[PDB]
Structure formats: structure tokens, C-alpha cells
């Protein structure tokens, strides 16, 4: 039976992890590899002029110095960019705003590299009692219902949904288990719960709601949650996790 996954997200900028520096992304990823993290997500926010080259150098370094599944994203807007990153060594790319505005992009990536190579990050917010998709880093209400987008996302060939609840992202307040439960029955795809991770019990709550993986950043980078303890705690509470 599949293990539930614990994923670490590294926000990167100009070649360095960002918390003001936060170490080298590669060596911080190596570290996560060794203490029990299951996959890495790297999100780039570098300026467009050096971004293409910078992310590509990151991917190459991560692919030949770590041996962990990883995803790269942040401002991937077209098939050619996604293609360069996958062929440079990324296992998956994340797309978001460009996915919403050009859904064929999902299909082009999936048909070339397989659906496993495509993650669609969906940012959603509850507006007037209905789940809505937002673009532009959670700042634009698209008018598209969360219910319709996840189905279209699977229809288009995505391999995985990275589901962030805009209300919880950046708080340490907890995962938005209501939204997971809302999405879980609408799609067969794996769901990464993102946004809100405060305490070990939060991960349990997300997996009980139907998440397949759980993503966090600060709580791990602040040596603020111990992955080993989280996994042991997860196991004790009856959740399949990959130990050591």
C-alpha cells in the first residue's frame, strides 16, 4: 500500500534558499533527503532575466547530487520552459496561472513527458460560500469554481494537484481539511495539501481528509518540526509512512 508523503518546499531566489539567506538550496535539499523528507518542491522567484538559466542550473545540480523525487516551479509559463526543466533533470514541473489561462499547456507536457511530470498548483479561496480558483499568487479571483477546475485539470492530463488554501497559506494555523474533503471525491489524482502546517497533528488531519501528501516549509526549515518524530507520530496514529 502507498505511503503518505511528507514534502518539503524550498523557496529559492537568485541561487539561494530564502527564509535573507537560508543556505544553498542543494545542500538544504541534501539535508532534507537524509532526515526523512519524501520529495522536494523548489519554487523560484528570481527575476526573469537570469531566471531561465538559474532554475536550469538548480535543476541540474539537484538531479545529479540528490537522489530524491523533486518538482520545480514558479513562473513556468510555456511548454518550452517546462521541457527544458524536465530534460535538465526535474522529475516534475508545477504550473499554476499559466495552467488556468492556457489549459492545453497541461496536455502538451503530459503528452511529451507523461502525466506524472505535471503538477497543477491550484490556489483556492472561499468567496461567498463557494470555492473559487485564484491566479497571480492568490491575488486574482478568476470566477472559476474549484469544483470545475479540478475536473478539467484531470481531464487535461495532470498527474498531481498541489492544493493550497489561500486563507491558511503563511499561517501556522492548520491545513484546510474542509477544502481537501471537498476536492477528494472530485478527482482520482494525488492531492498535496499545502498551506497552514503548524503542528504534527495537522498532517494527521490532512491525511484523514484524503490528502495523499503534505507540504510544508518553515516548520521544517526552522528545525521547528522533526520529520522523524512526525513520521513516528503519524505511524502510531495508523497512517502509512516511509520510515527512515
From Swiss-Prot:
Principal EC category: lyase
Signal peptide: none
Associated pathway: Amino-acid biosynthesis; L-histidine biosynthesis; L-histidine from 5-phospho-alpha-D-ribose 1-diphosphate: step 5/9
GO terms for biological process, alphabetical: L-histidine biosynthetic process
EC number annotated for this UniProt entry: 4.3.2.10
Function: IGPS catalyzes the conversion of PRFAR and glutamine to IGP, AICAR and glutamate. The HisF subunit catalyzes the cyclization activity that produces IGP and AICAR from PRFAR using the ammonia provided by the HisH subunit.
Name by which UniProt lists this protein: Imidazole glycerol phosphate synthase subunit HisF
Organism: Thermotoga maritima (strain ATCC 43589 / DSM 3109 / JCM 10099 / NBRC 100826 / MSB8)
